[PDB]
């Protein structure tokens, strides 16, 4: 036994493959595909719009660091959760 194994000791939750394309489209500027995912999630229920990426960033804290004032007004006209977003 001259080898050292490796593993994760403090585990956390992970994201599905349907809640990842959403956050990936938010980071690039695509405006016509996010508007469709926001509408399909009101007839069927497969995505929750308050997800959190590996580093604790949600869909409204990615649009503030990349200064985009046209996706913020779209995410606010739908009901999202505004927490400590005025201090950022």
């Amino acid at each position: 036994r001259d080898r050292i194994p490796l593993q994760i000791v403090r585990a956390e939750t992970e994201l599905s493959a349907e809640e990842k394309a959403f956050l990936s489209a938010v980071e690039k500027g695509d405006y016509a595909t996010v508007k469709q995912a926001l509408q399909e999630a009101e007839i069927y229920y497969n995505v929750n719009i308050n997800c959190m990426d590996p580093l604790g960033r949600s869909a409204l804290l990615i649009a503030i660091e990349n200064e985009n004032l046209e996706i913020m007004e779209l995410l606010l006209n739908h009901s999202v959760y505004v927490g400590d977003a005025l201090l950022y």
């Binding site: 490796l6 580093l55 604790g56």
Partner: protein, 600 residues
């Protein structure tokens, strides 16, 4: 794609599963740890990986001695790579069970390896420093007091500081010199004095003098009853210090009375009985010896021999112990009286007074070990300690330059050695009124050359009798050549080296004093009931709950530290040439596709 930190390419290449810049031993999990990404490491550990294990130092298996003689420049490269992989903060914080106790045991044996491998000394030394800031930051990411109390009192396998004692036996000087750790202690070293916000120079100066005088009554009160309301008032870290410091000035003041006689008898008897002043000094000596012998019992002998103030106490006790026998032998052997001008040079009463005089000097110079408890005199002892590591080498050179000349002069003047009776006033050697016979033997030629450094040696000691004139010139030349080498070329170098040596210890002169005073304070905290010298001669669920409570704090601390370290990078980094090219390519491809669509 792991050296240039992109994330899409790595995933894309994982999914689709004779010249290089990398040596033939680098692996992906080993190369992703030299860089310090957190998101790339987490993708390779969710698939199964492995890192080899390095053997201990001085190992002698057949492999370690066979491979080390077939290729010796390739065997000394793999160990450095493995040790650079194992010592990264992200890997330590992601897959360890106790991230604080793993940076203690790995930053201590990366310094031993810095001595047997002279080639990579700097490298190993610098790797040993990334393991001392990690724990300090992980500690100063705390937001309350209950968290500090939980962390500093964790014992693996009662309620004393069971984790602040392990950081002192590893010499971690940044983990015990922090505001919060130095504020949790000051609320225990000043117990019973609820407020120290008083006038600096009068009231707090007088209250201690007031407490000082009460040490005998406090001691006897503790002795007769240890559970009263007057007892239990000495078991406070400050009162014990005050009493022990006060029990010493009385001893050091009951000795000046024995030097200059207040009232005594005339001095003509061989051995007189001991006087009243001497009858009361033996208790202090007996108490000191008993304390010294007791301290060696409940403590490591190796730990004992590792303190440099112990040899002073040993010498003092030996020189104090010899006097009793030397004074009783003369009291039992001799009898009668005779004048002092007819005694012998080796009389017991005369040799029993030199040691008693010498001992007072080694007993009075020990009040310099109290300078660490004050803010003004503290940082001066630590800067003086460095000056004494500079005179050794110049002393080495000076001893050879003196042993060289101590022979030539002795070989030339050993023909004209006169006697004592044929000289005025029957005095022979230096220290007379008229100095003579300074270069006869080898023992005098060593004292003359020493005394000639300060200027207390005259020039007419090189004039010889018998009218011979050629010898005196050679003697004067040999004496004059020795002065230029010692007074003009050496003392002008000590100054120029000490000046440089002082301007490198001025920095970090406050991290090394607080460690010392903390190690001082931690000695009285335990219940030992140490009286002054004179009066000194008369199961599952608990462990489960603790291990369950200790993990949440670690999780929170790790989260905060990682986030802050990621944020600090984006703000304090500059641009370079790699960035310009990507923007040019973006514009280029946009142009090409738009023209393609529009034109056709």
């Amino acid at each position: 794609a792991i050296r240039k930190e992109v994330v899409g390419a790595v995933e894309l290449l994982l999914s689709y599963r004779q010249f290089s810049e990398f040596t033939p031993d680098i692996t992906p999990i080993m190369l992703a740890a030299h860089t310090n990404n957190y998101e790339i490491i987490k993708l390779l550990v969710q698939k199964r990986v492995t890192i080899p294990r390095p053997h201990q130092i001085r190992c002698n298996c057949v492999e370690c001695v066979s491979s080390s003689e077939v290729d010796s420049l390739r065997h000394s490269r793999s160990r450095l790579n493995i040790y650079k992989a194992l010592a990264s903060p992200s890997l330590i914080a992601l897959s360890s069970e106790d991230p604080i106790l793993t940076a203690f045991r790995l930053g201590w044996e990366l310094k031993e390896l810095s001595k047997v491998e002279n080639e990579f000394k700097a490298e190993y030394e610098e790797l040993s420093q990334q393991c001392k800031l990690f724990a300090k930051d992980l500690l100063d990411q705390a937001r309350s007091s209950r968290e500090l109390e939980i962390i500093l009192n964790h014992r693996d396998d009662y309620h004393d500081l069971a984790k602040l004692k392990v950081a002192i036996k590893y010499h971690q000087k940044e983990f015990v010199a922090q505001p919060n750790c130095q504020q949790l202690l000051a609320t225990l070293w000043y117990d019973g004095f609820p407020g120290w916000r008083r006038k600096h120079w009068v009231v707090k100066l007088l209250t201690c003098m007031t407490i000082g005088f009460l040490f005998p009554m406090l001691s006897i009160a503790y002795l007769i009853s240890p559970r009263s309301n007057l007892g239990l008032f000495i078991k406070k870290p400050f009162i014990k210090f005050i009493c022990h410091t006060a029990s010493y000035l009385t001893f050091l003041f009951m000795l000046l009375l024995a030097s200059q006689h207040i009232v005594r008898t005339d001095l003509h008897v061989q051995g007189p009985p001991p006087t009243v002043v001497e009858w009361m000094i033996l208790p202090w000596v007996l108490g000191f010896i008993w304390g010294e012998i007791k301290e060696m019992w409940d403590g490591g002998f190796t730990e004992y021999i590792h303190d440099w103030w112990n040899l002073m106490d040993f010498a003092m006790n030996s020189l104090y112990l010899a006097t009793i026998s030397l004074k009783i032998v003369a009291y039992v052997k001799y009898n009668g009286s005779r004048p002092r001008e007819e005694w012998e040079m080796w009389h017991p009463t005369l040799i029993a007074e030199a040691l008693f005089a010498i001992s007072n000097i080694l007993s009075s110079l020990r009040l310099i070990s109290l300078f660490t408890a004050n803010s003004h005199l503290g940082p001066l002892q630590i800067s003086l300690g460095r000056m004494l590591l500079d005179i050794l080498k110049f002393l080495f050179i000076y001893c050879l330059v003196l042993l060289a000349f101590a022979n030539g002069l002795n070989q030339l003047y050993f023909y004209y050695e006169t006697r004592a009776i044929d000289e005025p006033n029957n005095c022979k050697g230096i220290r007379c009124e008229k100095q003579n016979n300074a270069f006869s033997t080898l023992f005098e030629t060593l004292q003359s050359l020493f005394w000639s450094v300060f200027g207390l040696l005259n020039l007419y000691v090189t004039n010889v009798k018998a009218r011979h004139e050629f010898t005196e010139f050679v003697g004067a030349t040999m004496f004059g050549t020795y002065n230029v080498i010692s007074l003009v070329v050496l003392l002008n170098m000590l100054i120029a080296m000490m000046n440089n040596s002082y301007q490198l210890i001025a920095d970090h002169a406050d991290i090394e004093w607080k460690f010392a005073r903390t190690k001082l304070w931690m000695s009285y905290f335990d219940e030992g009931g140490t009286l002054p010298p004179p009066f000194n001669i008369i199961r599952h669920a608990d462990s489960l709950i603790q291990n369950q409570h200790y993990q949440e704090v670690i999780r929170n601390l790790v989260k905060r530290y990682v986030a802050a370290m990621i944020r600090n990078s984006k703000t304090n980094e500059g641009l370079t040439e790699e960035n310009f090219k990507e923007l040019k390519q973006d514009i280029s491809s946009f142009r090409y596709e738009v023209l393609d669509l529009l034109g056709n």
